[PDB]
Amino acid sequence: NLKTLQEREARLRLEQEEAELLTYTREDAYSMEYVYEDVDGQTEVMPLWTPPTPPQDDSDIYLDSVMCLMYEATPIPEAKLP
Amino acid sequence: TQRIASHSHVKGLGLDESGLAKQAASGLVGQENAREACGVIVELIKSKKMAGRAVLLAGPPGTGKTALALAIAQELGSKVPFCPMVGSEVYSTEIKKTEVLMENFRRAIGLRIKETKEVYEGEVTELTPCETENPMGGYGKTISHVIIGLKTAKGTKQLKLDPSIFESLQKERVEAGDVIYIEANSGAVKRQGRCDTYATEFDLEAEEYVPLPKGDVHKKKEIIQDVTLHDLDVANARPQGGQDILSMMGQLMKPKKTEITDKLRGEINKVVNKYIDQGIAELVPGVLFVDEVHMLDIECFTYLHRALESSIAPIVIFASNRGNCVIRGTEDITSPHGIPLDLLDRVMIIRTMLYTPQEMKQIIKIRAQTEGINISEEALNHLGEIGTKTTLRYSVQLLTPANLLAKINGKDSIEKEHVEEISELFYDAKSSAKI
Amino acid sequence: QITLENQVHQRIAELRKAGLWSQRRLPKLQEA
Amino acid sequence: DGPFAFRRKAGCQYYAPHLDQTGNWPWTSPKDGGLGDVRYRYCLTTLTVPQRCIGFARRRVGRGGRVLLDRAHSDYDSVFHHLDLEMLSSKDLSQILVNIKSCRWR
């Protein structure tokens, strides 16, 4: 009986190593939205990764992210001298 | 519904960190020494070291004895029980006075009882893995284990329970697809009902379908129940379960509140101590505020100054309003505060002086604020003056009617004219004495 | 005092040879 | 100090560099990388019909208009399965320390 329990536990373990979950239940999750509340009770919306939206104007200035590896932003004050 | 009561502004003794008294003491004003004594006695209560101690809130009428009583009660908090009682309630036609007093004492004492139970639930998938017959005997067909496939909302978990429970499974209608309420130690099965997932809209039935359990199969439900000792007394007093108790004529007279000392003390106290020292409950002695104590009969004081001698008696806050008066039930036996001189020796007297006219004005203003009506300076001064003339409680009662008169007259704030008109429409007893 | 002063001196002397310095003194980028 | 000086300036704006911590593309964590865009953030979420926390995940739209829910692995992937007791309402405080209880409801 001990050997049977051991082999049954091993078999069950093998089953857990293939895939836990594989579906998303589109019935509600597909259209329903996600929201959470932090420790401070503040609300935030779940940002879903959508393809690039069509730009309707000249907004969305070029960012050049690869340049941000060493630079962050441009402050207002400067040295202000020749 | 806010339903503002007579005196709800009191929220606590409002004593500073050092224990002294201040004016804006969380609603209650004045009464420095009295509020300091209230703080000392509430610290005593919180200590929960002494029992059977009584305190007397002696003071002339209008000193806010009940006000400071409710203040100290709120300071204690809803955690510890607070049973308010008036001397008139002791007079009962069905139960003797001393037993009513003992029941009130029991109510004043609280007791939190915890209860943790490990229970397993979920949709069952019954299956018995065939096992060789008992190896100690011959051969045949036996069952060494019974696996139950409890499925919960979070997942599935099969339990290889003891085979002896198979009788319980067959006893109740435990079929594959219903929710069962398993118990760790007992093991008894209590089917909650089929899963709502199978509750087809065309099936007409109720109380048979229940939703799936949310969370892991193994749940350790921790529940705490706070019941006063009087609750346990009443519960153990009357019977339950068969015995032809369903009768109406000879049993409907439930008011058998009569109680004996053997059951009250003794076994109940012992089981309470067993639950305490075992970790199943925690004793919580409260307070018994007895206003109008002078209204009690001498047969009540003679039992009070004996119950206070017991180790289990809780803290009692007496509040006598009368002065030197003959004790009820006695033949012209005058005693201070209408209380026998023997009981006054066992109570700490907290004297409360009369409110200063400035304190009267403060009380009137804070009561107007609590009511939610603005009052002009002249109107407030007139209210304070009339409260100095007659009883103070008359002024506070002139706020709401004056407020309504103002609102009906087209103005918002209570002008001096409104209070002046109300003082002539309504007046006090001192002026009514002119018969 | 007896040694900290010399350390501060040799640090300030070896701080910036001709401007190149990883901690600070980095020409700021131009916008575009 | 040397020819390389910030003394030069004109009618324009200059971007300042960040020192002591070199950043990476927006798809890196701000703690380790820099300017970590939330679009590439994997956060704990709870499904609708199931009552188990699948761990860190992020909503993403796929080909054909179908929305997918990527996932990640960390903290053995087991502590989060038990974290449902903290979102529905050591292995008990760890669920409260590893996260700020920012699990997505519904």
Place this chain on the structure above:
Amino acid sequence: SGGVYGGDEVGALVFDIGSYTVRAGYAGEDCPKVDFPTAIGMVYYIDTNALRVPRENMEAISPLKNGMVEDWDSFQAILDHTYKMHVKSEASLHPVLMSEAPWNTRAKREKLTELMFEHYNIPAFFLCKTAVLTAFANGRSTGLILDSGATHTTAIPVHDGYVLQQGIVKSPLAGDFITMQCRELFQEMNIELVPPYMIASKEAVREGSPANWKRKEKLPQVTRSWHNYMCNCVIQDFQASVLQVSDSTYDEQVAAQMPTVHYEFPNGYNCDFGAERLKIPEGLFDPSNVKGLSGNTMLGVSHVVTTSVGMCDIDIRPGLYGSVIVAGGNTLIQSFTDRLNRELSQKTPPSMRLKLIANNTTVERRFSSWIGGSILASLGTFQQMWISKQEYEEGGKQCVERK
């Protein structure tokens, strides 16, 4: 959310042509369904099966020399055979997204476009670089595409999706060198033999003892180049099976103490190489003491990458070091990626983030070019960059300004 801006799939038969193996397949798919040797059995037979049947001559020739197609006839034959057999799709029915090396000449590019728009009449065409696709395969707009094909090793950098042509470093170190070194080692210790192409049957052989087998009486196959190719097949099998890359400076103290590994030749000859199986993959990173060319001056993998980074502007190097993209067949060798990472870390200047994309687990590195091509084709915004038949027939036929 309808996802109107998701993507589009319009034909786009990606054809990633490679020196060791050509790849092909429809766009939108994740793995190319077509993968066969590139060399044709020119007497034309180009197939994993047709290229293994004995006939009169069957001379093996690779149309792409140095990654550059030169024999247009053999290239056209390969394309036609591939289409007809594997795809069964009419030429002028679906566009094509063939790939090219970063060093494709203008004249050769124009000739390829002409061959595409004249003999096949495909509805559209677009010729993207191999490094660009390899970068898109990993979702990277900037990085070092360390190609390690069978004939060249090049750390091509890309900037915002555009290849830096001046940063490429065409190092001769490649699979061909490893195969030649393995052939030399074999000839030194034993005699290299043809695969079962000629071996009728094998027998049990004691480890290290001479093998015995029966010779087939089929055609002699006087063409030695075909014999050279059949031997290179087994050489590459050996390379991918047992050959392992060192993890340190390769001192002659640890290799003699590592575990032993076995390998069986086509004739059954069993031999162990646990002592020097890691000697051959050394010139790749340290081409300083290779027995073949002892007086050579080459740059290892890490050296090639560092040079490719330095030859480009510094403003992009932060995005190049941090996004090294390893690709090509040589990389699948055991401990290759780890050795490369170690060498780059010890060589790269500190304070600059160095991250190796975790993609060595699978063999998809070879197909990275085709994956990137299929990805690019599946895009909607890219649907306008295709060189349509109208742009060509108009008279321009200029792929330089359009690509």
Place this chain on the structure above:
Amino acid sequence: YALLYSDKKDAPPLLPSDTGQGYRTVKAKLGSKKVRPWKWMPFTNPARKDGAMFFHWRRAAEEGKDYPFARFNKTVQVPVYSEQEYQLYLHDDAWTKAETDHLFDLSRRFDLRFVVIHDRYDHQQFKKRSVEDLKERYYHICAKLANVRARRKEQLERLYNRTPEQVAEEEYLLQELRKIEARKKEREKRSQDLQKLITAA
């Protein structure tokens, strides 16, 4: 520990798909509806700039809807000067008309990606130029055009200060870089000592 940030994918993860199970449960749910016919129809994208036409999978109900992604073709704002405009305003000694035209063509083709421009710049037809030089020339031409038509001051000196210093830093030898790190640690220790001193006072 903290939440994870990853672009593509981690080592062991896995994503769930949509549900198509319980056909019996949803039998009548989807049996009471039909499918909108999808047709392999031809579509013409207006951004093609030519008469070519391709195919795409769309429903027969929207045979129109020329192309959704067509509105993404936003060309960069690059002035287009004439020959006389160059002769009058943009005339230069080191530069020439053909070189400026080539620079502007590369800029329009690569969308103001001066790095890729310099990379693909024809160093044969025109002598070697630097990235900062191309940027200065382009910005000067744009400013002159915007002025004569009637944005911010460009300083080539700044780029002359940033790139060489950053290169010299990137070329820090191992020993000198370790020495610089040691000097940084020593300066941090001095700062801590100064903090301790000011706190003790």
